[PDB]
Design an enzyme around this catalytic site. Structure first.
Site, mmCIF file in Angstrom:
data_model
loop_
_atom_site.group_PDB
_atom_site.id
_atom_site.type_symbol
_atom_site.label_atom_id
_atom_site.label_comp_id
_atom_site.label_asym_id
_atom_site.label_seq_id
_atom_site.Cartn_x
_atom_site.Cartn_y
_atom_site.Cartn_z
ATOM 1 N N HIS A 150 -10.412 -6.407 -2.494
ATOM 2 C CA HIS A 150 -11.410 -6.431 -1.427
ATOM 3 C C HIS A 150 -12.600 -5.746 -2.082
ATOM 4 O O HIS A 150 -12.633 -4.523 -2.193
ATOM 5 C CB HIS A 150 -10.918 -5.645 -0.208
ATOM 6 N N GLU A 167 0.780 -1.227 0.000
ATOM 7 C CA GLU A 167 0.000 0.000 0.000
ATOM 8 C C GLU A 167 0.816 1.285 0.000
ATOM 9 O O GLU A 167 0.635 2.129 0.864
ATOM 10 C CB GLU A 167 -0.969 -0.018 1.188
ATOM 11 N N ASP A 201 -11.951 -11.059 -1.372
ATOM 12 C CA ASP A 201 -13.171 -11.215 -0.595
ATOM 13 C C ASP A 201 -14.198 -10.273 -1.198
ATOM 14 O O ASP A 201 -13.853 -9.201 -1.693
ATOM 15 C CB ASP A 201 -12.978 -11.040 0.917
ATOM 16 N N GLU A 212 -5.661 -10.766 -1.841
ATOM 17 C CA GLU A 212 -6.518 -10.765 -0.649
ATOM 18 C C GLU A 212 -7.989 -10.674 -1.005
ATOM 19 O O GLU A 212 -8.712 -9.815 -0.495
ATOM 20 C CB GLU A 212 -6.154 -9.582 0.248
ATOM 21 N N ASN A 261 2.316 -4.830 -3.414
ATOM 22 C CA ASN A 261 0.900 -5.133 -3.231
ATOM 23 C C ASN A 261 0.096 -3.866 -2.940
ATOM 24 O O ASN A 261 0.617 -2.918 -2.342
ATOM 25 C CB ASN A 261 0.814 -6.110 -2.047
HETATM 26 O O1 LIG Z 1 -6.936 -0.178 3.773
HETATM 27 C C1 LIG Z 1 -8.283 -0.453 3.415
HETATM 28 C C2 LIG Z 1 -8.335 -1.519 2.320
HETATM 29 O O2 LIG Z 1 -7.747 -2.724 2.784
HETATM 30 C C3 LIG Z 1 -9.793 -1.767 1.893
HETATM 31 O O3 LIG Z 1 -9.843 -2.672 0.846
HETATM 32 O O4 LIG Z 1 -10.405 -0.552 1.441
HETATM 33 C C4 LIG Z 1 -10.401 0.492 2.451
HETATM 34 C C5 LIG Z 1 -8.974 0.816 2.915
HETATM 35 O O5 LIG Z 1 -9.014 1.797 3.939
#
Ligand SMILES: O[C@@H]1[C@@H](O)[C@H](O)OC[C@H]1O
Ligand SMILES: O[C@@H]1[C@@H](O)[C@@H](O)OC[C@H]1O
Ligand SMILES: O[C@@H]1[C@@H](O)[C@H](O)OC[C@H]1O
Ligand SMILES: O[C@@H]1[C@@H](O)[C@H](O)OC[C@H]1O
Length: 302
Positions: A210, A132, A240, A238, A173
């Site tokens: 995510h 990040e 989901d 990651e 990542n």
């Molecule tokens: O860090 C967080 C991230 O993992 C998520 O996917 O979206 C919001 C962000 O704040």
């Protein structure tokens, strides 16, 4: 454990793995969770044990109990491992972020990468060296590393990683690299092109993925855009999706399946109750550790 392993079916299409995450607690809280991991997934990412706060709580003093367990479980069961994560602004001990002297931070950064990587030298398939580091607009995040060292920390992190363990794939990542044309994707692609052109050893780009409900269909184009950076490989690290609909999950699996650089998918968790976003039921197994519809859908599309 599902009778049909989505990992086995994904691998059948030339892919390296379809994995998930773990750590002591979830690997021991019941009998089903570890059984699901051994039967249906082929890779493991430690959920928290390898991060800076868990590995180096005090300057030069390491704590590897948790990470040792995760690595040993994976190795003992033929699971590929993805190290996570070496350099990140979150879950970072205060002693690191308070450093203002450039050469001192560089020394610290290198010592942390070296010690954590050396300990598992040869056992790690891939390492998320940097995590990040971008702002949503594609510019570099003003973390302590960026503020104190400057953009050069990127070269330093990767070059240290490469020399310490030349067997691991070095990754950068990030999240929100979920649709072609998005500012963060453009920022990730243009920076990696520049970094690769300068000789920095970045083997792959990891896209967290995510998602919210309905965001699955756009992932394919995102992976296509990322492939332009010029790295050897890319991966969904990651995954989901809130609601865990079959449409969203199958769309994400196909997005990777149909892009040659995508070597694998890691679902950020096995069952919903252990999810960091548990209220949204974003995983493949439910509160009873049984396969949900998405898991079977993913199986029948392969
Ligand atoms: O860090 C967080 C991230 O993992 C998520 O996917 O979206 C919001 C962000 O704040
Ligand atoms: O090791 C992690 C640590 O940061 C803790 O504070 O939050 C969850 C843990 O697994
Ligand atoms: O170095 C060893 C590490 O590789 C293993 O995973 O856990 C025990 C340590 O002593
Ligand atoms: O367990 C959580 C982990 O899944 C997430 O990646 O980082 C925050 C932690 O609390």
């Amino acid at each position: 454990q599902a009778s049909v392993s989505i990992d086995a079916k994904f691998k059948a299409h030339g892919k390296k793995y379809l994995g998930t995450i773990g750590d002591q607690y979830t690997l021991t809280k019941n009998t089903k969770n570890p059984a699901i991991i051994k039967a249906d997934f082929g890779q493991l990412t430690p959920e928290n044990s390898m991060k800076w706060d868990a590995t180096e709580p005090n300057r030069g003093q390491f704590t590897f109990s948790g990470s040792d367990y995760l690595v040993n479980f994976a190795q003992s069961n033929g699971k590929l491992i993805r190290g996570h994560t070496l350099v990140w602004h979150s879950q970072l001990p205060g002693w690191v972020s308070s450093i203002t002297d450039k050469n001192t931070l560089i020394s610290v950064l290198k010592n942390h990468i070296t010690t954590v990587m050396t300990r598992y030298k040869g056992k790690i398939y891939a390492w998320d060296v940097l995590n990040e580091i971008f702002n949503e607009d594609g510019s570099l995040r003003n973390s302590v590393f960026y503020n104190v060292i400057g953009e050069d920390y990127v070269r330093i992190a990767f070059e240290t990683a490469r020399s310490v363990d030349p067997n691991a794939k070095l990754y950068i990542n990030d999240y929100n690299l979920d649709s072609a044309g998005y500012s963060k994707v453009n920022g990730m692609v243009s920076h990696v092109k520049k970094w690769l052109a300068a000789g920095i050893p970045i083997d792959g780009i990891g896209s967290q993925t995510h998602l919210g409900a309905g965001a699955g269909s756009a992932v394919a184009g995102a992976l296509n855009a990322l492939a332009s950076a010029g790295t050897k490989e890319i991966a969904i690290t990651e995954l989901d999706i809130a609601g865990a609909s079959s449409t969203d999950y199958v769309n994400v699996v196909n997005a990777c399946l149909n892009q040659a650089k995508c070597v694998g998918i890691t679902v950020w968790g096995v069952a919903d109750p252990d999810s960091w976003r548990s209220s949204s039921s974003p995983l493949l197994f439910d509160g009873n550790y049984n396969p949900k519809a998405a898991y079977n859908a993913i199986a029948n599309a392969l």
